[PDB]
Coordinates of C-alpha atoms and ligand atoms in Angstrom, one line a residue:
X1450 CA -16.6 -18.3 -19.7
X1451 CA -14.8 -17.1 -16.0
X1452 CA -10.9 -17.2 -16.5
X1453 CA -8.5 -19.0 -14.1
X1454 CA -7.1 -15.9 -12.4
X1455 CA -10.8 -14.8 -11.4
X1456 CA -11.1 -18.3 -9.8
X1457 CA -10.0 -19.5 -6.3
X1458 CA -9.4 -23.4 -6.1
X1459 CA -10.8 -25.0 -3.2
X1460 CA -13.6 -22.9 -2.5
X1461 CA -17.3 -22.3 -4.0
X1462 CA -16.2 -18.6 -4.7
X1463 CA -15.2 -16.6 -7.7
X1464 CA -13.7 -12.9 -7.5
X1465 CA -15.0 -9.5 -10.0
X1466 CA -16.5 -12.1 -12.3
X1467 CA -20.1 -10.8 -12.9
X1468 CA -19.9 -11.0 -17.2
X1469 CA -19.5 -14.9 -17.7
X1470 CA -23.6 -15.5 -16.5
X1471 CA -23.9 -18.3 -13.4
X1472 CA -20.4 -19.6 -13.2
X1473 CA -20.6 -23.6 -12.8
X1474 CA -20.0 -24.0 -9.0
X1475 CA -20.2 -20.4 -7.5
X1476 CA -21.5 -19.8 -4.0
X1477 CA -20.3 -16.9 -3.4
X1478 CA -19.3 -13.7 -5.9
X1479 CA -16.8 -11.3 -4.0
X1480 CA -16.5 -8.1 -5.4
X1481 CA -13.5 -5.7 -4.7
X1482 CA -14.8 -2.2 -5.7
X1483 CA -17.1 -0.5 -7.9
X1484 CA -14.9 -0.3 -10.9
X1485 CA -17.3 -1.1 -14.2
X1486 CA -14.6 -3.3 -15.7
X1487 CA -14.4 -5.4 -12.2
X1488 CA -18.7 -5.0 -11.6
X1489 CA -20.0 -5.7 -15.6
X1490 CA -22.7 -8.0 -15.3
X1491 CA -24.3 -6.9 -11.9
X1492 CA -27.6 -5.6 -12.0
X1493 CA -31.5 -5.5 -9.9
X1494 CA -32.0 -9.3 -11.7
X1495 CA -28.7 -10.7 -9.8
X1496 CA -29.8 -13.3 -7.5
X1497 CA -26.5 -15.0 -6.2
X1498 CA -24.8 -14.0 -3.1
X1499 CA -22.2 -11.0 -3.3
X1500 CA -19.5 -10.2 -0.2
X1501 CA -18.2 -6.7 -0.5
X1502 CA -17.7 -3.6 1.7
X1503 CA -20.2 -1.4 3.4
X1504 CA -19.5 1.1 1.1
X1505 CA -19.5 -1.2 -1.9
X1506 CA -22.8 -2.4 -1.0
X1507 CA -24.2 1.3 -0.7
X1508 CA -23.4 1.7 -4.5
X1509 CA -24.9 -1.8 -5.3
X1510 CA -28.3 -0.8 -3.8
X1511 CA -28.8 2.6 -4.7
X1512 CA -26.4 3.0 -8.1
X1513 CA -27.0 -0.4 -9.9
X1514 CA -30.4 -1.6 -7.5
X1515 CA -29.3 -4.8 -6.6
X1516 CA -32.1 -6.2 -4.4
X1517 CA -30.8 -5.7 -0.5
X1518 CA -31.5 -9.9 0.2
X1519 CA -28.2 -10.6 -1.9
X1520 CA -26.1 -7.7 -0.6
X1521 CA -23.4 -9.2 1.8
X1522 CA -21.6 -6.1 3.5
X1523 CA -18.7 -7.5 5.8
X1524 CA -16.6 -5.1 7.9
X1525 CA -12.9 -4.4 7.6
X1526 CA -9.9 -6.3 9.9
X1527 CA -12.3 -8.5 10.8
X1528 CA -12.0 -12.7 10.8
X1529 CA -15.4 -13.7 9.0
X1530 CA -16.8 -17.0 8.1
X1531 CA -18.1 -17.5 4.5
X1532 CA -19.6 -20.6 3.4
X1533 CA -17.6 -22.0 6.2
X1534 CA -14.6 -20.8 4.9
X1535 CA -12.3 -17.7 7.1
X1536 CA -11.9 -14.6 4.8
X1537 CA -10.7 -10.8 6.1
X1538 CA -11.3 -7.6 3.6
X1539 CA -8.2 -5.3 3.8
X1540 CA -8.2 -1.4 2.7
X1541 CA -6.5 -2.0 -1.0
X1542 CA -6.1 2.3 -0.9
X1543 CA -7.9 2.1 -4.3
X1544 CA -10.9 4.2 -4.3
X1545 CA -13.6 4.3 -1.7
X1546 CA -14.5 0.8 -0.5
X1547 CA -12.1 -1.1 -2.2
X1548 CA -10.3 -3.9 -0.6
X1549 CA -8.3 -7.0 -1.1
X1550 CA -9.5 -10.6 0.4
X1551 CA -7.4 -13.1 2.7
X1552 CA -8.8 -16.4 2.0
X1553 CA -7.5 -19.1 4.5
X1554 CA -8.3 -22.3 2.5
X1555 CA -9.3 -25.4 4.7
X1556 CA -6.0 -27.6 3.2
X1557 CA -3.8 -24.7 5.0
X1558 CA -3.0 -22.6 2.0
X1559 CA -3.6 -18.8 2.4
X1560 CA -4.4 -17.1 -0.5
X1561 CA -3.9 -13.1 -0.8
X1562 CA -6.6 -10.9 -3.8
X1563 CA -5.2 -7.7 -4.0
X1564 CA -8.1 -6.5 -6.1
X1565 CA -6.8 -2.7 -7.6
X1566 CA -4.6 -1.8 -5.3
X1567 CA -1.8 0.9 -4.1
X1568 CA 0.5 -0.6 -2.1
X1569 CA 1.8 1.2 0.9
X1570 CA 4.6 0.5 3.7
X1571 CA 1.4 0.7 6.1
X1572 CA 0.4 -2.6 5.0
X1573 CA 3.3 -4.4 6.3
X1574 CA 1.3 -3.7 9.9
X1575 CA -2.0 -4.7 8.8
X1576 CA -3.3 -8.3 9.4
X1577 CA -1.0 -9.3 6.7
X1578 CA 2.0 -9.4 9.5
X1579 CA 1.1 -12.6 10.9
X1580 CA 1.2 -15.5 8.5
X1581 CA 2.7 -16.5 5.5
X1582 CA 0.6 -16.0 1.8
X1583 CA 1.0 -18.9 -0.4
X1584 CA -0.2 -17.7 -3.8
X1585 CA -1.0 -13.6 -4.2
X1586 CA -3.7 -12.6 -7.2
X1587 CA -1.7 -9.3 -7.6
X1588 CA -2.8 -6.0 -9.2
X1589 CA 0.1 -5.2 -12.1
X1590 CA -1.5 -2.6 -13.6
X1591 CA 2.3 -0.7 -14.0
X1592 CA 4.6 -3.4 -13.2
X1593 CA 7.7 -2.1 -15.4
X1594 CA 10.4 0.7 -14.1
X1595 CA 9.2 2.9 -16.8
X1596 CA 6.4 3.5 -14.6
X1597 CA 6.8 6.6 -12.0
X1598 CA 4.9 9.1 -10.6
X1599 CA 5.0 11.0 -7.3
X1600 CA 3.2 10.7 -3.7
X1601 CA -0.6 11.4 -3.7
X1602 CA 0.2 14.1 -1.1
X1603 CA 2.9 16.2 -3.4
X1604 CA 0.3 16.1 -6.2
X1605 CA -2.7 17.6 -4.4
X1606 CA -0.1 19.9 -2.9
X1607 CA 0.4 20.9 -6.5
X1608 CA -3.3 21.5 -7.3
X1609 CA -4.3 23.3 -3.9
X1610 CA -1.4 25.8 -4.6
X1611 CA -2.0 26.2 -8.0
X1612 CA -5.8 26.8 -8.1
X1613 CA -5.3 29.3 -4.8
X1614 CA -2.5 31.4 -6.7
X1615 CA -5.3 31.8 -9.9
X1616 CA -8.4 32.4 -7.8
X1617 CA -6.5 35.1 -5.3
X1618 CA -5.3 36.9 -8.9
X1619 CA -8.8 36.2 -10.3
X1620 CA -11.8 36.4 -8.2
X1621 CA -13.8 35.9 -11.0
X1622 CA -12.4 32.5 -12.2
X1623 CA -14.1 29.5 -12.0
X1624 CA -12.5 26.2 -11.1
X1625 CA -13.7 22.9 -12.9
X1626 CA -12.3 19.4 -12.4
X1627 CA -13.0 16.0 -14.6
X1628 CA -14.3 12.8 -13.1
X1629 CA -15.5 9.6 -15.2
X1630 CA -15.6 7.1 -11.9
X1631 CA -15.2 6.7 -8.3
X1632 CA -12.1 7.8 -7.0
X1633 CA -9.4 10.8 -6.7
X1634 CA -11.9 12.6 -4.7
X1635 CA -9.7 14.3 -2.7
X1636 CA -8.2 16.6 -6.3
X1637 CA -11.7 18.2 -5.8
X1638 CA -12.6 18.4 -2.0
X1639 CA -8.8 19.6 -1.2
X1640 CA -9.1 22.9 -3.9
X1641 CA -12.9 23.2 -2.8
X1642 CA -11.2 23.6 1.0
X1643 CA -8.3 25.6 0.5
X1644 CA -10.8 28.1 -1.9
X1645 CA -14.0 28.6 0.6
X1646 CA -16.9 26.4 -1.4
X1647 CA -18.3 23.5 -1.6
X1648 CA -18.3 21.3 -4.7
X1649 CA -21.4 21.2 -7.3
X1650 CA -22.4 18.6 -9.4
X1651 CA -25.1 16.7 -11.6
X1652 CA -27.7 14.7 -9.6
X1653 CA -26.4 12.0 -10.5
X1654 CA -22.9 12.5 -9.3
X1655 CA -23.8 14.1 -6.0
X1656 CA -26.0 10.5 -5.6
X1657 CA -22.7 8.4 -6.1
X1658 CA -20.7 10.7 -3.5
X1659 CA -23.6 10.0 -0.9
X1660 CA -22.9 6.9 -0.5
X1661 CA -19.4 6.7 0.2
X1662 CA -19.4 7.1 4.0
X1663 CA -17.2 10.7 3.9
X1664 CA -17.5 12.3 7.2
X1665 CA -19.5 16.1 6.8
X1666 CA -20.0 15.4 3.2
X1667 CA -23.0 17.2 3.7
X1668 CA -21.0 20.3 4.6
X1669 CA -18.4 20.1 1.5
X1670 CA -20.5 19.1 -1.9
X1671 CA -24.0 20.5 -3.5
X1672 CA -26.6 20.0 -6.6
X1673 CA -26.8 24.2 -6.1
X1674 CA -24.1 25.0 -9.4
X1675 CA -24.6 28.9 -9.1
X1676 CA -23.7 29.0 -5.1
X1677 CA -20.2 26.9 -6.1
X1678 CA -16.9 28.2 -7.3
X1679 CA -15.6 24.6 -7.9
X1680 CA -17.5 22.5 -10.2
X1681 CA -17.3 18.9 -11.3
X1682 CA -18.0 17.5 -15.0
X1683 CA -17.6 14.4 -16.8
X1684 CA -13.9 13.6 -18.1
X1685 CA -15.3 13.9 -21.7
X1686 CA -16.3 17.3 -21.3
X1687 CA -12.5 18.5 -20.0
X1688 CA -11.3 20.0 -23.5
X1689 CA -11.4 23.0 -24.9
X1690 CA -15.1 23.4 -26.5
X1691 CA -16.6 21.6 -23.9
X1692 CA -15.2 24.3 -21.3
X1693 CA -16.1 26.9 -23.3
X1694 CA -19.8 25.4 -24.0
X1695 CA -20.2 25.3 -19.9
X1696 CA -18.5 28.9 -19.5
X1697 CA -21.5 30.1 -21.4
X1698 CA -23.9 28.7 -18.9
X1699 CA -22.5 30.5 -16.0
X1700 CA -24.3 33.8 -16.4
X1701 CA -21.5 35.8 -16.8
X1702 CA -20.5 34.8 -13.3
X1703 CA -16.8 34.5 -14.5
X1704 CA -14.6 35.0 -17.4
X1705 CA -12.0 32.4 -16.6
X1706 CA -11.7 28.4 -16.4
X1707 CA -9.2 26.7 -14.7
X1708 CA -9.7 23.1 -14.7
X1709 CA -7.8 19.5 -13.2
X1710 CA -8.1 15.8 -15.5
X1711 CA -6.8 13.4 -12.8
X1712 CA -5.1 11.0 -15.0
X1713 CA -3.1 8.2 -14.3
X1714 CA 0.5 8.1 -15.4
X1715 CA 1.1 9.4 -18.5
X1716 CA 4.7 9.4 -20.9
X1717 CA 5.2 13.0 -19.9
X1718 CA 5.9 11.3 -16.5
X1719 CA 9.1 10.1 -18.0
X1720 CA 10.7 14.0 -18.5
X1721 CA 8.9 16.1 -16.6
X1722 CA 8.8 16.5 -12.4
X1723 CA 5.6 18.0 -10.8
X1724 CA 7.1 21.1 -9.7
X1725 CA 7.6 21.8 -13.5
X1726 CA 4.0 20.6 -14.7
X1727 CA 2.3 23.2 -17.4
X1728 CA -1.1 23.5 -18.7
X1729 CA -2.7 23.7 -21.7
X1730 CA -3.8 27.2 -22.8
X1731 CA -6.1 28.6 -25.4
X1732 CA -7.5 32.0 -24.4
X1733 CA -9.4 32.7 -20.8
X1734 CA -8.9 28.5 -20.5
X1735 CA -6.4 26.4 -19.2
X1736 CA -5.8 22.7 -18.6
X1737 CA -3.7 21.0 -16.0
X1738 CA -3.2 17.2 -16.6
X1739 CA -2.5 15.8 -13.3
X1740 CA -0.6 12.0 -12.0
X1741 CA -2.9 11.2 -9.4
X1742 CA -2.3 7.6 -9.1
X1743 CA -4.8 5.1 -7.3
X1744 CA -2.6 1.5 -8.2
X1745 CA 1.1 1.1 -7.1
X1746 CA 4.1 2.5 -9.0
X1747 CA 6.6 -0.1 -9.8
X1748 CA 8.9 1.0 -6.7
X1749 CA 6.0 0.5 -4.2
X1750 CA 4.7 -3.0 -5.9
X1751 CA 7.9 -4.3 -5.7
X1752 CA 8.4 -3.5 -2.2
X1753 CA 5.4 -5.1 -1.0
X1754 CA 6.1 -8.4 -3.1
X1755 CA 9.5 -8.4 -1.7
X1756 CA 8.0 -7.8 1.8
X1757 CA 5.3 -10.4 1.7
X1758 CA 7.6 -13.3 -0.2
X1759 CA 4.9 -15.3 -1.8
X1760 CA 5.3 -18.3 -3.0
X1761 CA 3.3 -17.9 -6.2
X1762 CA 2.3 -14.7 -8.1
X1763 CA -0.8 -14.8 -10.4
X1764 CA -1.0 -11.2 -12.2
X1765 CA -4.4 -10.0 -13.2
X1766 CA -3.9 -7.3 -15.0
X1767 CA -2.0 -6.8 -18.8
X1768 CA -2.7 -11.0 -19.1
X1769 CA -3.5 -10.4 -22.5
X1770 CA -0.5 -10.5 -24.6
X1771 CA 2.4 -12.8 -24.5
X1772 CA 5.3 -10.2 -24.6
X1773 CA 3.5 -8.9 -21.1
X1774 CA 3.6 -11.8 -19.5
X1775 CA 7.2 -12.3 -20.4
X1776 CA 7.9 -8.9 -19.0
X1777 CA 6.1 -9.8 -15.9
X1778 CA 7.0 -12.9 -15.1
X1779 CA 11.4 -11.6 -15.7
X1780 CA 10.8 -8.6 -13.1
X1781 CA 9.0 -11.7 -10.8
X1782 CA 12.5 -13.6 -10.6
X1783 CA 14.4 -10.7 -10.2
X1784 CA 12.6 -9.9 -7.1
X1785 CA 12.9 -12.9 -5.5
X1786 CA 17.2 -13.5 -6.7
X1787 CA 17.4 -9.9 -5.4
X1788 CA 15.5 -11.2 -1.7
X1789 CA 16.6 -14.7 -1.3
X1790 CA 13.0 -16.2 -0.7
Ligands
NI1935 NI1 -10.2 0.0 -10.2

């Protein structure tokens, strides 16, 4: 059975809720990325409307097979009407094709999804500028101060610099980084850039990357391992025998392994800046855990919240326990003593 916070009063339409079966009153199933944990359920035996992205809809069709009848793409910025409702999709600055809805309800209230989300000042000067939100569905993922990690930018800067330094000292090292999902794709395309190759990957992988809309992505990844410096592998596989096991299947192409696991924050986060970041070592291999963060850092959620001053906050994410939602609902108030709304 769907719970509350995947519901939207007033409306025929339910959001990332594909696991409860045909939800009692559901015209419409909206869903804000292709996450597993926000998609479970979907499959090529769905027959109920779904309202998504363009690029969401690629992965639908070709990833999961979702029959192209039920498949509802709408574009971004855009004032559509659903079910005679008015909606908009907003970049959430998630991974490819995620976004958050604007619902404009017909008794006047204006409801704000966030979906997984990153919040950014740029979104104070999206469609968001012109109206007040009455109740926000909001992303909380790492709403507590605890939670800090730097700019997207500083840590590919890190990685580019890094992987350039041990390639220029070692031609004949090979770079690997993890992936387990959609997202962080600019870790691997930026050190693929600054180093001269293109990316190879599994079949399977190179299918997902094809349908995210990436100008020249033609010209940047490829199936072809042995023509590839930098190569991709599942997350799994980023430790030291499975490193070793793929070093072996490189024809004695290189004798070195640097490699990348794009995590999110981690408690190491807490002591150590990313100037200072050190790898893991044993032998010709080493291991750089990196904070490339795709959801908001407490600093940039509460800025956002602040900004938009809604009159309701509904969190959908750490609902689970009751010393969360304490947590949650304490930083809540603070914000608003702290802004006056
Ligand atoms: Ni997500």
């Amino acid at each position: 059975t769907c719970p509350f916070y995947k519901k939207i009063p007033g409306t025929g339409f339910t959001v990332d809720a594909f696991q409860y079966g045909v939800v009692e009153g559901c015209t419409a199933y909206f869903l804000t990325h292709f996450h597993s944990d926000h998609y479970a359920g979907l499959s090529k035996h769905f027959t109920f409307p779904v309202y998504c992205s363009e690029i969401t809809g690629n992965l639908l069709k070709n990833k999961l097979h979702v029959q192209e009848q039920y498949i509802h793409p709408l574009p971004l910025d855009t004032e559509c009407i659903v079910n005679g409702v008015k909606v908009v999709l907003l970049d959430a600055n998630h991974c490819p094709g995620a976004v958050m809805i604007l619902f404009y309800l017909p008794n006047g209230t204006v409801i704000l999804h966030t979906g997984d989300f990153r919040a950014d000042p740029s979104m104070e000067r999206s469609l968001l500028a012109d109206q007040k939100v009455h109740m926000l569905y909001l992303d909380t993922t790492y709403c507590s101060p605890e939670y800090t990690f730097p700019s997207q930018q500083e840590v590919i800067r890190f990685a580019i610099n890094t992987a350039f330094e041990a390639v220029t000292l070692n031609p004949h090292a090979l770079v690997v980084c993890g992936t387990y999902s959609i997202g962080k794709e600019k870790v691997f395309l930026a050190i693929a850039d600054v180093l001269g190759s293109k990316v190879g990957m599994s079949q399977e992988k190179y299918k997902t990357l094809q349908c995210l809309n990436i100008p020249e992505i033609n010209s940047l990844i490829t199936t072809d391992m042995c023509s590839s410096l930098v190569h991709l592998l599942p997350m799994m596989q980023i430790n030291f025998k499975g490193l070793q096991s793929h070093l072996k299947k490189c024809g004695g192409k290189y004798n070195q392994i640097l490699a990348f696991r794009p995590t999110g924050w981690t408690h190491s986060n807490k002591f150590t800046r990313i100037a200072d970041v050190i790898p893991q070592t044993k032998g010709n291999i080493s291991i750089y855990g990196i904070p490339y963060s795709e959801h908001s850092s407490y600093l940039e959620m509460k800025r956002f919240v602040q900004w938009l001053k809604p009159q309701k906050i509904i969190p959908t994410v750490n609902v689970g326990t009751w010393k969360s939602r304490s947590t949650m609902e304490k930083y809540f108030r603070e914000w608003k003593l702290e802004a006056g709304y």
